[PDB]
Amino acid sequence: NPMEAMYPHIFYFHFKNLRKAYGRNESWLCFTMEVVKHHSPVSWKRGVFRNQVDPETHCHAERCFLSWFCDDILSPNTNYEVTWYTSWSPCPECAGEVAEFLARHSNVNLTIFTARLYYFWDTDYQEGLRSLSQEGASVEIMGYKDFKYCWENFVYNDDEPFKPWKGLKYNFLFLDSKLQEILE
């Protein structure tokens, strides 16, 4: 960890936007970096993060990524532009913590695509999610478009084409509508 590829099921079992469908007690994060040292080349970085369960360093993926990014990368005076493809979305208290990283780290920009939502009625979630988009970080909901790109590059697809499910395009509409309301 961080591993660079989800096994075909790990993707389906944890990336299906099935709201009231109980079956996800963890969260996965897929990303793509973008290093830009003012007057120097531009390199890429991609991978996958899972929630930890060992003695220490719990982190719900979102956090686990911030750790990896701080003491490992985070180059002085250089810019960054990361993209996320989270599954069990920034948790009620995570979304807020992430929005405060982009705070004391202006050299980094972020774009977040998510499959589900830790409920759209929870206060903490409305807080951290609204405050996240206030710090300049576009938060959208994975549609058929995003699930394809996410399956083709972060899954040991064995060269198999993405196969959509019943409800995808719907739950997108419903998840997007209920987000565009909280993200007003």
Add this chain to the structure above:
Amino acid sequence: NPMEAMYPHIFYFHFKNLRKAYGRNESWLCFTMEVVKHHSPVSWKRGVFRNQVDPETHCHAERCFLSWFCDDILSPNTNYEVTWYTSWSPCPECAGEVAEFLARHSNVNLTIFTARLYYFWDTDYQEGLRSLSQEGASVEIMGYKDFKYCWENFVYNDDEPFKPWKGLKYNFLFLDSKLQEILE
């Protein structure tokens, strides 16, 4: 270790006999024993073995079966009918590590059925994979008939039809001829 079966999704993945199958950082060993103490009912011994990548004993799944069958089982003066179903062909130091085993334990007869072959161009694999079928064992490629077997006895198929995958017979044949070239 020794667990009794593999979940459905786990099987179809680590057992797909592909050439480009990238993502299998572990080999799986399945088996059916057949104990004949001569003066009792013919008993058996099923099971499955995931490999190892932890602190103690970094056994390549094949190495862990010998340790389990050496002291827990193996009754002096009793013929054994062992049948494997390895996903990842026997590794270099393992192909010989088993040939030396089969050598001393004459009462043990073996016949292996692999799904994929580990770098068939290499010598060290051909050395072991050769002297191995030269002992009394028999190395063979899993065809449709064999895979079917596993989906019935070594997986929690939940009473479900096999359903192969494009290029099973094709990959099978090519793998067989590439083996029969070496195995001589």
Add this chain to the structure above:
Amino acid sequence: NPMEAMYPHIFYFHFKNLRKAYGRNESWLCFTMEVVKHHSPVSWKRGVFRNQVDPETHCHAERCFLSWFCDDILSPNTNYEVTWYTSWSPCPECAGEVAEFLARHSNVNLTIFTARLYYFWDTDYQEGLRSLSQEGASVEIMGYKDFKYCWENFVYNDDEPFKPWKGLKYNFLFLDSKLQEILE
């Protein structure tokens, strides 16, 4: 430098206004001048500029045009009508490096038409790209009409129809709105 035109294949590539357009490690600047010494025929000045990544002068294509137009051309007391067609939006230190130029050389009027925008989230780009159209210049996104122009005057099209590409108008619009957001 200053070459007169781009080969067909070279144009369609470095000029495709895409969002994910990865592979453009150089910016291209096209232009049409219009010299009016007031008491003579209205002359012009065409051309194209590839950037630099060699030993001497690491000018970002935009920096090399100022050096070429500073001493070789530019006749004191003569209005200039400059029109660019940059593939890669003006870089941070260049957006301002040109605003300070346009400042002193009042007789020089400019209007830029970019194909793609260089990290619009960043501040340093918005600083320059703002004070630039605040000088007397005008930054704008290349639409279908503009691209067409180039394929006629800055490329060895060999007498051939334009033929856009999927997502030209779409990418165009989104890029325009993202610019009009900053440009204020």
Add this chain to the structure above:
Amino acid sequence: NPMEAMYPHIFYFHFKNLRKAYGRNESWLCFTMEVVKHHSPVSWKRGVFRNQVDPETHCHAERCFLSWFCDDILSPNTNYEVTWYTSWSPCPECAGEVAEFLARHSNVNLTIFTARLYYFWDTDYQEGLRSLSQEGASVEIMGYKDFKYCWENFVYNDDEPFKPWKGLKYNFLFLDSKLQEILE
């Protein structure tokens, strides 16, 4: 150099198997590495090599790759399995030189796919090509299958699907037949 992606035309202008069609005075090589340190992880390496023209270090791609592989990589006691997708095939005297690298470097295995052939009547070519397959290195001719995989991974495709030409499947047949005769 070695760069990691060919611009769309560089691919078409140099990878089209148009025998008597004069228009290729250079050669390109696309590859994929495969590091295997006995009991350690397995990393990948991909890129592109072009013929040099600078003062020294000429090399026709084939050679340029051997240089890069020697003093840079080539890890002691570790194995390697490279694959090539050459354009202007191993030159009359290169094919032979490559076959002699695989000689004093048994830890490395090779597979070569090519678009055209430096003529199939040239002695030196029959020598080096026959001697190349003698050192254990399968040399085949790119078909529609190979050109697709080669275009989708080594070309700034801008996410565009491979588009085949008139003669591809034919010249394959003719190039493969005239190779299976020399590679008897």
Add this chain to the structure above:
Amino acid sequence: NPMEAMYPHIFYFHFKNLRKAYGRNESWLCFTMEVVKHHSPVSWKRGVFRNQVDPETHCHAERCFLSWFCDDILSPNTNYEVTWYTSWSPCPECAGEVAEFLARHSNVNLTIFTARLYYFWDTDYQEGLRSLSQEGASVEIMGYKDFKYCWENFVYNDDEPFKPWKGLKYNFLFLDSKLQEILE
């Protein structure tokens, strides 16, 4: 006649608002009544009507509803809230046959929602379909909202989600404008 509901498969078929929809040799009429005798509980009356093509009474589904509502129901001095859901727009001799009905039975208020329009170019349809909404009725095209209604109250949906079909809203809109052109 009057049956209470349509099987799932039957609905999606005879109700697909298509332009080329060929194969509907029968019209279906669905309805919800709302009886208000003023001095009693507000009751209702559901139902569905298949047309006719048998020996006696060749009523076009619409003609059969009037016969059923004329003597079996219709209590003098009681307001009626009728709502139809015809698949096939009211036929020529039917559009007027209903306008003359609505005329005399003033206590009857109606509002129709059709799925498809029967040859809108013809006059005889426009004559009826005009004087019909000029009586107190109201002819309208079934949009997504209305179709949904039916899949809930007039079909044995077996507790299942609606799931429209490509070109529902598209065909809907075009049909609406083609109606609003006539209906004037």
Add this chain to the structure above:
Amino acid sequence: NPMEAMYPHIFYFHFKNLRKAYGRNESWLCFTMEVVKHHSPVSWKRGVFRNQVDPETHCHAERCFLSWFCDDILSPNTNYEVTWYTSWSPCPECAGEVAEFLARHSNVNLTIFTARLYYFWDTDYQEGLRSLSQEGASVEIMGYKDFKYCWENFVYNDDEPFKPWKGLKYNFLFLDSKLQEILE
């Protein structure tokens, strides 16, 4: 009747080769004629036949078609070449009766494709089916190929592409194998 098109479900509910899957108490026949009057043009004829249930003229489709073909068509001295796409195959005693029509009617040739089989152990069926192929009439089993052509031309498809099911390609294999044995 004979109608010229099956409603989408009538096709699925009656053309699915689900052996022990009880749910087909009737039979449907889809066909294509071919008139050839020695030295005259060549016209076509297509349609669909369902089993009758009225007072008289029962016939299980197979028969209903022979009736229609006798007193209606069957032109003297002219040839015919019909093709069938039957669902609930020639019944134990029908297959035989059909084989005896081709007897006293040599001017007619036949080709039969079927979805299921009225069991392959029934004597009468082995009789009539073996005797049917003896009279020159190729009897095969609908595969994915046949179901597509059969769905695209004999079903009010509303311009929708054929959508295959779970078991199709399998039951074909099993039905074809068990037929090639009886049709020895």
Add this chain to the structure above:
Amino acid sequence: NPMEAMYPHIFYFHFKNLRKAYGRNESWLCFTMEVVKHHSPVSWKRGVFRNQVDPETHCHAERCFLSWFCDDILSPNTNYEVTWYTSWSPCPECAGEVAEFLARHSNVNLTIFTARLYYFWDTDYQEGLRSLSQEGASVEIMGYKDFKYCWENFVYNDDEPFKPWKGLKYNFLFLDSKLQEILE
């Protein structure tokens, strides 16, 4: 004649919307009828008409169809709804003559799709084309959509998919724009 299918080339040589591209001295018409006898079934009729060159009965397809429709069909009191897919459009004096047929024949409605235009500057053409749409007959320009349906049903396609050309989608735009101006 009227034949019911164009040979693959006859379609390409005469249905390509290549304005100034000289190579069409004749005209072809593809159609689909629609009989509707008030309270009777609804039958279809399709075919192809070519310009005559024999001694008499010249007619430029458009006319040849009116002849066939008059003394042959044209049933009293019954309605009709025809559709055209003309190639060398209603000639300057034909378009007008067609518009006057729809005059003394109100029971017939028409929809015309065309590939090219007998020039959009010719008076007679502006007359007959404007007067044609005045008599209630929608005249549009074949796009990719129309050419597909037209190729799949009126051409001996040998089961081959429609293959579009260079300029189709463009000339449509240009032909549609220059028509929406005259059809104001």
Add this chain to the structure above:
Amino acid sequence: NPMEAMYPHIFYFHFKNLRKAYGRNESWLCFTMEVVKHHSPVSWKRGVFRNQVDPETHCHAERCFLSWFCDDILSPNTNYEVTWYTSWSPCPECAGEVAEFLARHSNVNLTIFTARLYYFWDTDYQEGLRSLSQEGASVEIMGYKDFKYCWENFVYNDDEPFKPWKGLKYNFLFLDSKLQEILE
């Protein structure tokens, strides 16, 4: 009649050896003669024959060649090497009409190569097509090699490569076996 060659588009159409090839209401006969008067230079005679469907002589292309070769050519006491290339297999009354010809004109040797077979189930075709190759002629199916020949000698290919079509060899083989079954 006798014309020297077929236009490109005409060939590929009437010569496509398909099973469902519907649309060929005419047969084409190609041929190469080889006159040997024994005491002169070996001359030849090329040509092509379209069938007939006009007032006088309704010859089926094959019947018209006999009339042309009976009086215009055919010099008593001179061996003839005739080779046909019929698109449509010899018709019933023609297969025998030629067998009776070959019978009397012994000095005439023939060998036919057909593209498609006319209703091979029929008897009258087998009668002729049998006694025909029993005379000294030889009926055979056009494979890839033969078709190629025609595209070189009987068509205005305008110096262009053959380019077969999907299912040429496949249809070829099946047609050959179906012929070899009869031809016995």
Add this chain to the structure above:
DNA sequence: TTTTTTTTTT
């Protein structure tokens, strides 16, 4: 995939 394309249709 629960309702509609983004410039010149290999």
Add this chain to the structure above:
DNA sequence: TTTTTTTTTT
């Protein structure tokens, strides 16, 4: 793409 599928057809 110059002639033919490799196990259970979202």
